[model samples]
Target: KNSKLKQDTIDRLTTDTYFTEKEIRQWHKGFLKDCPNGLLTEQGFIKIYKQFFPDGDPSKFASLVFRVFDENNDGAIEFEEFIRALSITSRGNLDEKLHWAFRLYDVDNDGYITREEMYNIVDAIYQMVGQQPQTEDENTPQKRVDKIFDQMDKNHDDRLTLEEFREGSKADPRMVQALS
Candidate 1:
């Protein structure tokens, strides 16, 4: 049995860095085995909150997260509400954090982010991670800026909107802060 399992062990080790369908199923089985009860009990939420924010008060984070989700501000997080909140939090405030989110979301080449324009900003973030990195050989500040601008202007539109700006920011989270 040990000899037969050697190939399976080798395969698992090779692919451990990337989760696969089989691994996800195995993890689900393990999770179910560890918790026969449902995963999201009220106490479970509290425990998770405590574990995630051990040193700080979780109420503030919880309230912020809830406020984003509670579109109507009804004080309850339904499933749809939670998903919408996740979408926003995961891809919200590009203008707050990046220079171009405001530009791209302002679809008419204007200078503001409307709610409908916000969707493009989120979509751009989803597409940003696979772009090429700047070559170390061209390390001058001007070259770097040019390379950054070139890479970010995916549509080559000569202007970066909030989506493009956010994508650029995702490439370098510290850039906007450093500029400030």
Candidate 2:
């Protein structure tokens, strides 16, 4: 029934993403098989992420990632955005990748990202991946985000634009470690 939906999505994805129609179609097939309802819920996303790490919990960080992926207030994630995210995460260049990270940090869509938000996301990741006690004690999540601001917030505004984030992320490649 929604074959035309796939048609339009494949067209757009092939044009806007590095993936080709064949790949997109393959992914779409798997997506449909996995998500028979064709809907992605926040809880379901956490479940999938959790499956990736049997020894750790990914719900906390997955929630934050879900915020960026939801894009709208709807209760479910659309296929179009889902595929776009998959494409970017798999093969987008550095600049494109940074933009995706920026979207995560700028959760409020207020044109800037705050240290508070940054800390929450970082801490969530720490819990998600189960950080070692040594690192946890030596570099608290708050301290980590603080140092990031110290290096990235050049204007002392205490907030970061995508431009600033991009510059800082690129300058210090280590900053992107948590993102992946």
Candidate 3:
């Protein structure tokens, strides 16, 4: 349903949103050069995602992010989707950014981020970045899990809302970096 919009369409998608036309235009020029068809395929997006980490394969994390971009669920990413991603990550407000992070973390589409969900996402990130193995008594993924879960879940239902995630991220520099 209305997938594969043109470059101009993507350009205007952010016209009244968080991004400026000037910023989007610069990004558009780069996107056009990379995607000749003006449409972003899953493989291409995943490839780009891995580049950010650039140590090992980050396919799990990349695929999760890609799924967020494929908003129409048609297995292809149009310009609108592409620009929307760039906007939230690099330019949007904390609420907007965490909303996106929430969606990526909300693997089940349940509108809340569970502890297991946070573990899975963080574990994927650990693998993707080729992190060192944990030693005994080291703060395992479980240890970090509490700080994340505790901070992000304001409603205290063992799940995180977008609002809580955003509020907490503003205070936690690590969370802000991770979300970014």
Candidate 4:
């Protein structure tokens, strides 16, 4: 049996994303099969993400991921948003992936990641996996942000622009490291 996607939908997805018509059809089938409502709600995504990270409390991190994926902030993820995000991670190059990474870290959408933003993210991550450094002084979330800024904040402005993030993270993989 064959599945169908609109000709225009196939054309657009093919041109804008790394998917061919057949692949798009396949993904559409699976997406609808799982998300029959035609939109991926926050709870739906969190359920899937949490399932993959059963050892950790994925609630907060999953929310952040959903926020980024819900590009238009309409409170749900559409097929286009879902597909584009998937394409970037699965098929896009390192730079493309890094750019997406930048978007996630620049939580305020202000084009820079300040010390505070990084601090919150690091804290959330540690909380999710219930891991921490033995010494409170050296490895708290605050100290981790301090270390990250010290290494990558080349301008000493206590903020990381896209350039700084991409270049520094390229060399120091840990700078952008997170659960994938």
**For this target, which candidate reaches the highest lDDT against the unseen true structure?**
4
For residues 65-139, could you state the per-residue lDDT of candidate 4 as single tens digits? 788899999999888788889999899998998898888888889999988888777766765676654666676
Lowest summed lDDT across 10 adjacent residues in model 4 is found at 1-10
Clashes of each: 9, 0, 0, 0
Root mean square deviation (Cα) for candidate 3:
3.2
Candidate 2 segments whose C-alpha is farther than 4 A from its true place: 1-5, 131-138
Native-to-model Cα distance after best TM-score fit, residue 3 in candidate 3, in Å: 13
Ranking by TM-score: 4, 2, 3, 1
The 10 consecutive residues of candidate 1 with the worst lDDT sum are 123-132
Q: Model 3 off-target regions past 4 Å?
A: 1-11, 14-26, 51-54
Off by over 4 Å in 4: 1-4, 132-136
User: Which tens-of-lDDT digit does each residue in 49-163 have in candidate 1?
Assistant: 5566555444433433334334455554333333233333344465543443233245544654333344333333222322233547776334545555667677876666566
Clashes by residue pair, model 1:
100-161, 100-162, 100-165, 101-162, 102-162, 103-161, 103-162, 104-161, 104-162
Q: Which of candidates 1 and 3 reaches a greater TM-score?
A: 3
Error of 4 at 145 (Å): 3.1
lDDT measured at residue 150 in model 3 versus the true structure, 0 to 100: 88
**What are the RMSDs of all candidates, in order?**
15.2, 2.3, 3.2, 2.9
Per-residue CA lDDT of model 3 for 48-165, tens digit only, reads 8778778877888778878898989888887677878877787787677777877888888888788898888887777788785675664787787787778667778898777777
